[PDB]
Amino acid sequence: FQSMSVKGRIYSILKQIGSGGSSKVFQVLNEKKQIYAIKYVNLEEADNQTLDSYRNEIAYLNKLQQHSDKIIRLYDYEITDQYIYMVMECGNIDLNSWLKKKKSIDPWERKSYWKNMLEAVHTIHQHGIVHSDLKPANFLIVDGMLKLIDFGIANQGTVNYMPPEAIKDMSKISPKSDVWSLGCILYYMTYGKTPFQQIINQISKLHAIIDPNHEIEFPDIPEKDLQDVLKCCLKRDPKQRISIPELLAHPYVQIQ
């Protein structure tokens, strides 16, 4: 019902899309009735380390803009000592909501989304960023295309995407940690669950994730290339696990 000004430009609020700490996301229209998302962050409570993680993520977002269109667009922002406004690309729906709603997935759509995920994460890795907390909610469907919305710098199931080396760390986290998590995302898109969704007791689930005697199941599916990808991503030893550059040359993404 209200206005917002970001760098002298006035935006009308259609609805709130998002909650968070200490952020709200709004679907808004500019004066030409073009649709945007505006992320508002309140900075009144934020301490200096937090402030710096916010500035650091904005800066990477801003920079990684020009390197890939599988990173959400940040069009502009206004930052003061009281608040951040970020004017961004508006999404249709996040991947986690889409997956909960979708009964089965088209193999073409799945392969396309996987390519998009790979291209976004590859990009951040090239600039030295390991996300370390990849989940479907980090991706947004925009224009039939998946985009990474978050780099894991500021925000810092949900345990279902956690890699074994993060759990054994309890330094070991590398770009390969993101391959495990992506692998879990593709496993879900393939077999309709994450690999350890079955294990409800959390102490147990975590032990499963790190236990090499616990064999992950890969039921036979018509795409043998896809099976192979899941198996290569879901290797517990990160040195034996496939890398992003290798995953980009894989027949699953290169051939059809």
Side-chain angles (χ1 to χ4, degrees), residues 12-13 73 76 92 95 128 162 165 170 187 210 238:
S12 324
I13 298 165
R73 306 290 86 192
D76 208 0
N92 301 325
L95 183 51
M162 192 171 304
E165 67 265 27
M170 230 86 71
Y187 192 98
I210 65 154

Side-chain angles (χ1 to χ4, degrees), residues 49-62 64-68:
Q49 176 277 306
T50 293
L51 282 175
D52 204 70
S53 75
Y54 295 173
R55 291 162 183 153
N56 191 248
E57 182 141 4
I58 291 175
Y60 274 106
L61 187 46
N62 194 218
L64 295 201
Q65 284 309 280
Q66 305 96 23
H67 295 79
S68 175

